[PDB]
Amino acid sequence: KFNKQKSSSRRKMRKAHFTAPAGLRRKIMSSKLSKELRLKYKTRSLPVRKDDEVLICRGHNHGREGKVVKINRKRYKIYVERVTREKVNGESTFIGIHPSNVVLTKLKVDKNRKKILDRKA
Amino acid sequence: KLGAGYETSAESWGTGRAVARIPRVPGGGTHRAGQGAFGNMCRGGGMFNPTKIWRRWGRKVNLKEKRYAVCSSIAASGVTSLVLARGHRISHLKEVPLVVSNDIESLSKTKEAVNFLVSLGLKDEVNRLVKSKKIRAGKGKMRNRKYKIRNGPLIIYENDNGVKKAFRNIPGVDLCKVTKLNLLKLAPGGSIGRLCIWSESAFKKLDVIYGKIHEKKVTKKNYILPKSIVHNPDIYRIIHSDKV
Amino acid sequence: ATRFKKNRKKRGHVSAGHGRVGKHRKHPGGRGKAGGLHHMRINFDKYHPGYFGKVGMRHLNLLKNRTYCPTINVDKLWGLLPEEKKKEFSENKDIAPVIDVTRKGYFKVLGNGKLKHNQPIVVKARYFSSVAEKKIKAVGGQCILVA
RNA sequence: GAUGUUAGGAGGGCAAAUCCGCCGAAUUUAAGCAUAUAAUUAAGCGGAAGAAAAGAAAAUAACUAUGAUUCCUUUAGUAACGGCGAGUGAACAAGGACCAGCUCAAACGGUUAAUCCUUCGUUUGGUGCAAACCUUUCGACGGAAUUGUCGUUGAAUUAUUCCAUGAAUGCCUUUAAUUUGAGCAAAGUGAGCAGGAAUGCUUCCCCAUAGAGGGUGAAAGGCCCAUAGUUCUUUUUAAUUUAUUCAUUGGAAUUUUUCAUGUCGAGUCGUGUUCUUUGAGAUUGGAGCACUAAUACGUGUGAUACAUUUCACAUAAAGCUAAAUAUAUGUAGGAGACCGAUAGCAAACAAGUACCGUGAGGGAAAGAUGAAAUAGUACUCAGGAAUGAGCAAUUAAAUAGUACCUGAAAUCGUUAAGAUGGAACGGAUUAAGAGAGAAAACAAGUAAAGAGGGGAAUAUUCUCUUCUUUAUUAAAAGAAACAUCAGUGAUU
RNA sequence: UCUUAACCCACUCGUCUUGAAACACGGACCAAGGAGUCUAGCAAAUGUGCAAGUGUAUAUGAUUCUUUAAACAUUUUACGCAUAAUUAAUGUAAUAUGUCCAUUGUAGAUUUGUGCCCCACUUUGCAUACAAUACCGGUAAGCAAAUGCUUUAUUGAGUACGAG
RNA sequence: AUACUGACGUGCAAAUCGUUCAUUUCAAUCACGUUUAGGGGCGAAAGACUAAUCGAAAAGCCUAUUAGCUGGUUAUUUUCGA
RNA sequence: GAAAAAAUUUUUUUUUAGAAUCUUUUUAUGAGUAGAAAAUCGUGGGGUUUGUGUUGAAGCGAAAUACGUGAGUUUUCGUGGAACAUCUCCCUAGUGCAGAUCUUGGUGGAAGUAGCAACUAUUCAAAUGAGAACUUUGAAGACUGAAGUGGAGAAGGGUUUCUUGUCAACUGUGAUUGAACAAGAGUUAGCCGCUCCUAAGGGAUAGCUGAAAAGUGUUUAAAGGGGUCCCCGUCUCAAAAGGGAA
RNA sequence: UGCUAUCUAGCGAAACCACAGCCAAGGGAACGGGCUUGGCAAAAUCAGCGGGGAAAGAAGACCCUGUUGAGCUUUACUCUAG
RNA sequence: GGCCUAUCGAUCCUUUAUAUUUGCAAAAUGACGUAAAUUACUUACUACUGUGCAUAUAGAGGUGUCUGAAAAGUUACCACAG
RNA sequence: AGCACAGUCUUAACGAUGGAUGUCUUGGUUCCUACAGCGAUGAAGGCCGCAGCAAAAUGCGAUACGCAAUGAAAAUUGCAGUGACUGAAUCAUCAGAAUGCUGAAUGUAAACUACACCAAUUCCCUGGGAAUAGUGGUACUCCUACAGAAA
């Protein structure tokens, strides 16, 4: 913006969003952190891991809480346990949720994640 | 691109075939074979006159003319009726020539800036600006023309030590340094009578500029002030006048 | 520009203001100045009388700066004074204005027009006309030759 | 001068936008055409660089002169050239950008070349993890070379001042710039309403040296990444910061005083000639050919052939050199009052591809479901099988069903209505049918009881107002008809 | 509104063409694309700014550095065109006071006056037209010891208190 | 490939088919390999042939060559008008 | 600067102009190609202004007691599912189609028509399969008639072969067929070819010309082979039908 | 006599097409399918045919015009290899 | 100039007349002319000054397709624009 | 259960047909800024390969859609394998690897996987033991150095 090196064109920014490397995709699988935890760490946002616990804030399933099943980094969908959906034949899969539609409560904290939390503090 | 609409190898197939006299591509088994080639009528044929780079990028307009426009636009900005006429909401401003203390040129925050405009009474203008943030129509938007947003206050300043940081990130509000003063910002869209907010320093410096004070013989090579003899008394007074 | 041009006036009118009989052709007289003498002679004679044939010597390597001379007429010399200086001379017949015309870039002083008679002026210049010198002497002034 | 698969090395080739060399046309223009023009261009064959080329006076001036090159502004469409027709066409000054100088050769130095190089070696430093780079003087053994390497820019001689030099001990501190990757990085996922799902609508909040941008099931400063702001780490190069003693050798610049007056690029200049070329003109540059020079008091210049002589200015025939400048190419960025899928690069795509040509070559058509197919058409019935249908079934939506957005016109199907004697449709004018509509094309007010809004009075008393409803009095508006006028006719 | 009716009228459009309904030519139908432009240099017109000047050229400067690829400024007296012309060309280049003054006519806008207005006389006389003289450069002729002159001829994109 | 100017003449075919006729041991025919390339080749000569292409091939470029000549040349009202 | 009407003097209702390219008023006038002008209208973008958006925009189809002389504008109903306008003013343009034997794409009428006309002839019964004139089997009848619709091979093609499936398209009629489509499999050399040799030939060396590119080819040679320091002596590719080891 | 045509089942084009399609006479660009006055004029079709459509092809190769060409020739002008 | 109405030719180019008028680009070419001066690189004063070339003005040499191209034939082999 | 001449023309409704319009858009485009040569240390170009299931682009080269190293760093799935409480699985960086056959192409060649000649060669182990006909070298011109030959 005030920097005149980095582009503000729509076209390039979109292209970067779509052709993103896996690490870049992982970066934009971030979610807002739950309100007391947010206060505790003074941390707005964290990248989700597969075993985390979210509350859904948008879509028809808003106000459902639950553990995260699977992440699809590539096409930008997380899967949550209580947003099941049956297919056309009646077979059950999970509804995909955009990561900005959910707020994160319980983070699973590994050594690396702890080091990141330490960096944020 | 210069050669565009003519790069392909093609010629008129000529008389004896009833087809048009225009050039056709004389290809093989593919659909280009005998297909219309060059010129504005044909598919892929390019413009009738492709654009050369030069289309009068540098025009003049005199030093005296430019100077006149700035002076006259500042004079117009002075006028209360013109400020309202330009579409600025202005009923609760105390009077249109707004000169403030130099404390403005020391401000820190966006909040202080908003409070300052509200204190002046320019709240209604700020509301109009805040509302006027919208996504543009038409096929230009995607050529990096996302918004249309309107124009409110222009702050005319001596020192950059508050206004620069304070009124930055404020929708529809512009700042300009008193020496610098651009006509395009003083009269947007060619519309005279923008709401101009002056520091006492800026206002006073303006008088010095057109006062012939300091800087030896330099200013306009010993010159000041557009000052033609076109004049009023208003017309109705002249006719009403008892002798007349 | 495009708003106001001739196509917008003539847009649906087929022969385009260029004549249904005539039918506007690529170069209907040939190029540029070609028809001179041959068939456009009457135009050249009535509008361009000095044009054809040679006159005079050839200088082959002239150079403009050798013959460069800006001139001034005597009439306008008192005008090279500012207003207060002109008033001061008008008042005082004891002293003459000296005028160095070189600072004003002039080199020859020519003789045109009237003067407010009986007032001396010193003119310093490279060149003077016969009449200019005579008028400056006549009004009680002086001419000074100076390179 | 041969020879060597001798030892160490090099050149070759590709790419080309800008750059440089040769070689080198015509269409065209003159309304024809032959000179001129196109054009010292296009094609052709060659060579380079991140820029090159040009460059340190055989220059311009005639002034009170300037003083390597390039480039811009300019002179200047001028001097000038031209079937003097068409047309073509410079230089000097000036304002600037920018400025940088120089060295071979010859001359000079013979105490025995003060030179150069290969091979073999050898060590005082310093980084880096390691690879490795980086400094560093000393010896050999070979060669080269006096058919000339090195030094030196007249020569000594005086006084001054500077510069290289080596050792010991001290000491490498603070900042500023500059430029990489890094990080950290503000407030709401609050009501209420309708919704397939808000980021919508409202309404109550806020944050902003972040209200650029993108994504987020519909328009988000406060949903996320980003963004503004900063905190560091990276590149180099400036200021600051400390020197103190002991040591040889050598050199330079001035300055005196003597003495020396040397030098200065040849089949080259020049002239004749030819052709080319130009602004060059009784030949401007180039090149071919013939003849072929002079020594600094020479000879090159001073845009008209010449003789005789000035005067001013220069020092050819050897070489190098940064910068401003150019950059339709390659790559990397940033862009846009550009195009928006028949446009725009030939190419938004599995396009320089398919396909075509013996081959040189020529060269396309070709984007869009949905929010989500980790929602992609389940199941049943009738079907040989395609398929169809469903009381069945996904989705907000399937006449959204994957050759899926919207889905125009040509064209054609069903139904309905009308028509129809060798065209068809139209204009002008009424008709009868078939459809649509009440806003001018009627109904102000009053009483009864439902819904709202206000104002005053001191959240609620008084009171003013507009819509629905029942019935209950007006009226106005247009069209008729006759009478009455004024204007205009015709009649007897 | 649409729809037939019936009465009256109604010849293929475009086209080049003296003359097209033509036995003149193009057109099976529909969709989309599809043609007086841009630059250079010149001219008049009009607008606009300044004026005997005008145009900041190239370029420098900045607390100009999302916009800003323009906008702003011109050093704590370059160049274009216009300011007098003429001409092969060296050259030459005043309408003159010897109250800033002082070119001559005739029409002619405007102004003064008279006898709550038109007037008829007078009064002043722009612009412009139609002339007139000068004078400057060329060219003559006449003279001629050049500050070369001269009554008198002619000629110029001339000049007669600047207009660009 | 002489004739039937046969069939065909929106073909089976950018020269076919039928019938007729000429040629057959030599200046014979056929293949494969080879040579000569565009104002050039090659020609028992017809301006023949040179890849369905020839009184100057094909390819690409100069090139958007040029044209007193042909065709086309797009909304409305109003005005003056050859 | 006050006119009328409704009520029952006093209440109510209608109207009540000042935009100097504007408004009131009068009189005259109205042909039109080539051609010139003015006033408008519409399209893309930009600045400017103040609006329209998912209780549905643009777009589109059908229309509208609609407005304007007209270009057109506006609206209703239906579709549609995302962005849309600016007449307040003004810059900007690749800006307005019936036509070019226009360009490109789609599509009709012609028309169930032209047509599916070389090469003597097929029949009967069965099998297969949902379905058989043109698949398969059998029985008849026939033809090609060894210059063969037969064997082998070259060029050229390139898995077309072959087995197993198989029927969306194609197989100009049908079709279960197939040189079509899908899956697999298949080509084995001391002795058969190439491979070796030279020819007609091609490319180079040595040279020499040519700015180079190239043109040439022993033509001013100090270059490859055999013997035991001598003797020969340009090289190389070129026949799948010449020569040639089995 | 064969093969087609013809009719059926199946398959299935194209050229072409302003709009089309009854005549007589007149006038008119001096030869009209449409114009004007007359004759007249009744569905839908199936098979033939070449009167007419001044039928189709394709910017008449004829002829003429161009300060467009090209091939060829000379004691046309001007060059030029040899 | 010819009794009148008829008896003729641009620019560039060539050529010769003419001038007390000019140029050939830093200078000069009659002439040390005329005076003085001479310890000399002296100082004044002079209307009429080398070859060659260039001008300016005035005629003449020519353009009869006569407001002024240095210009023959041919194509039934032909191409193209109309 | 009856009633409708058919055709042609026209009209409206509702569709087929077709892909226009509108709306989009990881694309073009031009300008400006910036750096800017690769090659016998074998390039570009071209072939031939290479995926567990793998055709075409992309990617890569017999170690072949990843190796090593680094920084991120827990997943990866069409099937199937694999890995995680950080040198594996995933990405990006990529400085160490490797580097097919060719191609200037250079041993002679060329519608050849043809053909010479000279070196035989490679690995393991600490100065010894095993393997393989495999692997190299051998163009033309030039230069500097050396050599024994000649006049």
Automatic annotation (TrEMBL), chain A:
GO CC annotation: cytosolic large ribosomal subunit
Domain annotation KOW: ranges: 47-74
Positions of region (Disordered): 1-23
Pfam families: KOW (PF00467), Ribosomal_L26 (PF16906)
Composition-biased stretches (Basic residues): 1-17
Stored SMART domains: KOW
Family to which this protein belongs: Belongs to the universal ribosomal protein uL24 family.
HAMAP family per the UniProt record, alphabetical: Ribosomal_uL24_A
Protein name, entry field: 60S ribosomal protein L26, putative
Organism placement in taxonomy: Eukaryota, Sar, Alveolata, Apicomplexa, Aconoidasida
Automatic annotation (TrEMBL), chain B:
GO biological process entries: translation
GO terms for MF: RNA binding; structural constituent of ribosome
Entry GO CC: cytosolic large ribosomal subunit
Source species, domain of life: Eukaryota
Keywords: Ribonucleoprotein, Ribosomal protein
UniProt key word Ribosomal protein: yes
Stretches assigned to coiled coil: none
Keyword Ribosomal protein: yes
Family, per entry: Belongs to the universal ribosomal protein uL4 family.
Protein name: Large ribosomal subunit protein uL4
From TrEMBL, chain C:
Domain of life: Eukaryota
InterPro entries, per the entry: Ribosomal_uL15 (IPR030878), Ribosomal_uL15/eL18 (IPR021131), Ribosomal_uL15/eL18_sf (IPR036227), Ribosomal_uL15_CS (IPR001196)
Biased composition (Basic residues): 1-13, 20-37
Pfam families cross-referenced by the UniProt entry: Ribosomal_L27A
Cellular component, GO annotation: cytosolic large ribosomal subunit; large ribosomal subunit
Domain named Large ribosomal subunit protein uL15/eL18: residues: 71-144
Lineage of the species this protein comes from: Eukaryota, Sar, Alveolata, Apicomplexa, Aconoidasida
The name this protein goes by in its record: 60S ribosomal protein L27a, putative
Keywords: Ribonucleoprotein, Ribosomal protein
Region named Disordered: 1-37
Keyword Ribonucleoprotein listed: yes
Alphabetical GO biological process terms: translation
Family: Belongs to the universal ribosomal protein uL15 family.
GO molecular function: structural constituent of ribosome
PANTHER family (UniProt xref): 60S RIBOSOMAL PROTEIN L27A (PTHR11721), LARGE RIBOSOMAL SUBUNIT PROTEIN UL15 (PTHR11721:SF3)
